[PDB]
Each structure stands twice: as C-alpha cells, then as structure tokens.
Ligand binder design. Structure first.
Ligand SMILES: CO[C@@H]1O[C@H](CO)[C@@H](O)[C@H](O[C@H]2C[C@H](O[C@@H]3O[C@@H](C)[C@H](O)[C@@H](O)[C@H]3O)[C@@H](O)[C@H](C)O2)[C@H]1NC(C)=O
Lengths: 215, 220
C-alpha cells in the first residue's frame, strides 16, 4: 500500500502563531490523469474528521484562507497561519490516487498562558458503598500546562495505591485542561479512617493545593 | 446542510457478524460514490470499502483486509448505504465512518461514526454515582457537580447535562480501562444560586447496552 508518515507527532503552538504539518508518502501520488489526490483533514475532540484541503492545495467550503496546502513529489505540507483555539485537534493527510490510505495523524495543542487549578473534593456517595468499594474524587479544573501531580493522604499518611488519574482533552474555548484523581478503597478501609486529603502540585505554585473532608 | 448519519455499532464476538447503516441527506445521493472508513487505536484511519453509481453497475471496491468478509451496498431511493461485516476479528474493532465520495476527489462529508468492539468479553452497563459538595466553602468557580461513571464495557459512553441544554463548563475526562472495566467522570460548574433552587441532571448513554441513564444531583 501507500504509506503516509506525518510529522511531528504532537505540535504545541501559541495562539495567533503559525503551525506546519508535513506528510510524506512511500511513492508518487501523481495520477495518470495529471492530478495528485493528496488531502488534509481536521478532527476535533469528539467530532468526526472534516475536509480542509483537497488535491494538495484547494480549500474546501467554509475553510478559512488561513489553511493552505502544498506538494512536491512525495512531500506535502499543511500550513495554518493565525492559529486560534478552535484549531485544536488532530490533522490527517490522506491520498486517493491509489488504494486510499491515511497518515498517522498530528495532534495540534494550544500553548496558552499557565492557569492554576481549582480543586474540589467529593467524598464517596453512599450509593457506591454496597459495591464493596468507595471512590473519593479530587477534581482539578481549568489548568494549564497539562502536567500535574495529585497526592492522597488518609489520616495524615500518604496512600499511593488505589489511585486512577485521567485528563480531559484541551478545551476549545479557553484551552485549559481538567483532570480527576480517583482513590478507590474497600468499603471497610474507607470507614477505618476519618480524614481524606488530596494535595495537588502544579507548575502554577510551590505550596500544594490542599482539599480534604472529614466524615 | 449535507448530513450523514451512521448506526448499528456495539459489541460482537469473533468471529461474529454485524451490519452498519448510513443515511445521507442534503444532496442528490444517487450522484455520489459512498465510502466506509474505520478508525482504531492500533491502525489509525483505514479505508474499508467503496460503492459507486448506478451507471457504474454499482461497482464495489474493498480493502485487502476485509475483502471476502465485508460487503457494501446502497439503496438510492432511501439515500442509504450499508456495510455487512462477517467473520469479524479483534482487528476489526474501531469506529466506523460513512463518508461521501466528493466530486473534488476526496471523501468530503463524514458522519459522526458508530463504534464497534469485537471481543469475547460481555457487555456491562455503567454504574453512576453522584459527585456532590462535597460540603465545602465556595472557592472554585461557584459550585461543581458531577457524575462518576464506573464499571462499563465496552466503550464508549456519552455524558450530557440537562439533556444538552447545559453545555457551558462541562468537563469529561477520558475513560480508563482497569480490572477489565472502564470508568470516567463528567463534571459541570454552575452558579451557587442556580442550585439547588434549579434542576441539574446528567444523561449517561451507553450504546452497547442501549441504556440512557438520567440522574439528578440533589444537595443531600
Ligand atoms: C485506485 O484508484 C482509486 O480507487 C479508490 C477506491 O475505489 C477511489 O476512491 C479513488 O477515487 C478518488 C477520486 C474520486 O473522485 C472522483 O473521481 C476522480 C477520478 C475525478 O477526478 C473526480 O472529479 C471525481 O469524479 C473520489 O470520490 C474518491 C473518494 O477518491 C481512485 N483514485 C482515482 C484517482 O480515481
């Protein structure tokens, strides 16, 4: 088949700045009829891919003049000037000269100003207790960069196992992230202790953002 | 104005069968070739099949990997195109998109997609617990509420608030697979006045089990 390799794999870019995605194929995409069917697509979080550029450089309908494409042999490039929030997502290149193939994709991330997190701690709901486990959730909302560390303390003692951390995709509006840390204990483990504390350490601070509840 | 909508996904065993449907609207369906493209986290986007026009005797073309197992067909009168899948394998797992063969030489319009999971593990509907304030002082954008969706399989699960009416400041982390099950969280932030005075509920949908779960977070 025709292989399409895209670079970079991840692309951090500032608002209003310029981004450049490349796509290289394993063979020539020039068709006998003289056209080159290399296209670009944008896939936003949760949404399906949308066509931006067709036949190397033709912009699709509604596609702003900020998106432009070019080609040269087996090398192709997608360019986005004046990058803006709504531009985040994964850009793919694809060809239809031969059996259709797609590139691996390039995630475009919005490099924005740091934002300190807002912490909320939710003790377990009594509705969960009969499951045999209890989940204490520490929600860190609207922060940036993505990197963050959450530590859990049960009655002063740090607890490492039983924790599951997961992030949201970058927000289309303010370009921040949110993440939740979930500490899951056996029901009785949870009742043999009274103070549950989660400490979050983010680039936006030295002192840990602490949130805790007592039963 | 061009609209494409697929359906028919879910969990299947290996080597079972499954049929997907796609309904288009907004354009003279009969004048265009139609495609099926799937996306998996193991092989990324992969073209599966194509079916041309009436004048073309509905010529069909399949990717080498599905040739002899998948069959694509269309019905110009009802503006639909289908994908019959047999002897499914774990590799066939992924999101399947229906797309139009654009006049411009590329697949121009894609549907939202429908997920397919080929596995020997069975379906498990999610359990939903309320995430409530946790009784504290207002110091984090005014009150944050949420729904903890645990123990479901397979993916995906969609979460909405107030049936979609509430969409500002909604945050949903991605799922994580552990102990053989997925789980995620979805939280929303609202003014400490518009609650509990007003009604806030989360709508958790799980296609594979065809369940829609509606839960309202009360002060409790
Ligand atoms: C091996 O040739 C390629 O086979 C694929 C699988 O059947 C086709 O998807 C692919 O077609 C291309 C181009 C097609 O656009 C129409 O046909 C071309 C020739 C015209 O130039 C154009 O104006 C349209 O009428 C498009 O719909 C599909 C999705 O991709 C085919 N390659 C070519 C170059 O035909």
């Amino acid at each position: 088949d025709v292989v399409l390799t895209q670079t970079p794999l991840s692309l951090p870019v500032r608002l209003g700045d310029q981004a450049s995605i490349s796509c290289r194929s394993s063979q020539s995409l020039l068709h006998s009829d003289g056209n080159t069917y290399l296209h670009w697509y944008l896939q936003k979080p949760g949404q399906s891919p949308k066509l931006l550029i067709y036949k190397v450089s033709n912009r699709f309908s509604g596609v702003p003049d900020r998106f432009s494409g070019s080609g040269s042999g087996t090398d192709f490039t997608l360019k986005i000037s004046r990058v803006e929030a709504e531009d985040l997502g994964v850009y793919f290149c694809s060809q239809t000269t031969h059996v259709p193939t797609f590139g691996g994709g390039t995630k475009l991330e919005i490099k924005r100003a740091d934002a300190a997190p807002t912490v909320s701690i939710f003790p377990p709901s009594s509705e969960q207790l009969t499951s045999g486990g209890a989940s204490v959730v520490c929600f860190l909302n609207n922060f940036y960069p993505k990197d963050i560390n959450v530590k859990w303390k049960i009655d002063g003692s740090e607890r490492q196992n039983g924790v599951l951390n997961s992030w949201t995709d970058q927000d289309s509006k303010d370009s921040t992230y949110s993440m939740s840390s979930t500490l899951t204990l056996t029901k009785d483990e949870y009742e043999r202790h009274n103070s549950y504390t989660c400490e979050a350490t983010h680039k936006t601070s030295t002192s840990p953002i602490v949130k805790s509840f007592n039963r | 104005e061009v609209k494409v909508e697929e359906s028919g996904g879910g969990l299947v065993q290996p080597g079972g069968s499954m049929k997907l449907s796609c309904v288009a609207s907004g354009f003279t369906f009969s004048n265009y070739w139609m495609e099926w493209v799937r996306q998996s986290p193991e092989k990324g986007l992969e073209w599966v099949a194509e079916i041309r026009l009436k004048s073309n005797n509905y010529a069909t073309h399949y990717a080498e990997s599905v040739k002899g197992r998948f069959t694509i067909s269309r019905d110009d009168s009802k503006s639909s195109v289908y994908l019959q899948m047999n002897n499914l394998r774990a590799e066939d797992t992924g999101i399947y998109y229906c797309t139009r063969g654009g006049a411009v030489g590329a697949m121009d319009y894609w549907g939202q997609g429908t997920s397919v999971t080929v596995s020997s593990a069975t379906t498990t509907a999610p359990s939903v617990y309320p995430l409530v304030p946790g009784c504290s002082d207002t110091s984090g954008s005014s009150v944050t509420l949420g729904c903890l969706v645990k123990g479901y399989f397979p993916e995906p699960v969609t979460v909405k608030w107030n049936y979609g009416a509430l969409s500002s400041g909604v945050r949903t982390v991605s799922s994580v697979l552990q102990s053989g099950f997925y789980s995620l969280s979805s939280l929303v932030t609202v003014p400490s006045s518009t609650w509990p005075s007003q009604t806030v509920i989360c709508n958790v949908a799980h296609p594979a089990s065809k369940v829609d779960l509606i839960k309202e977070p009360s002060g409790p």
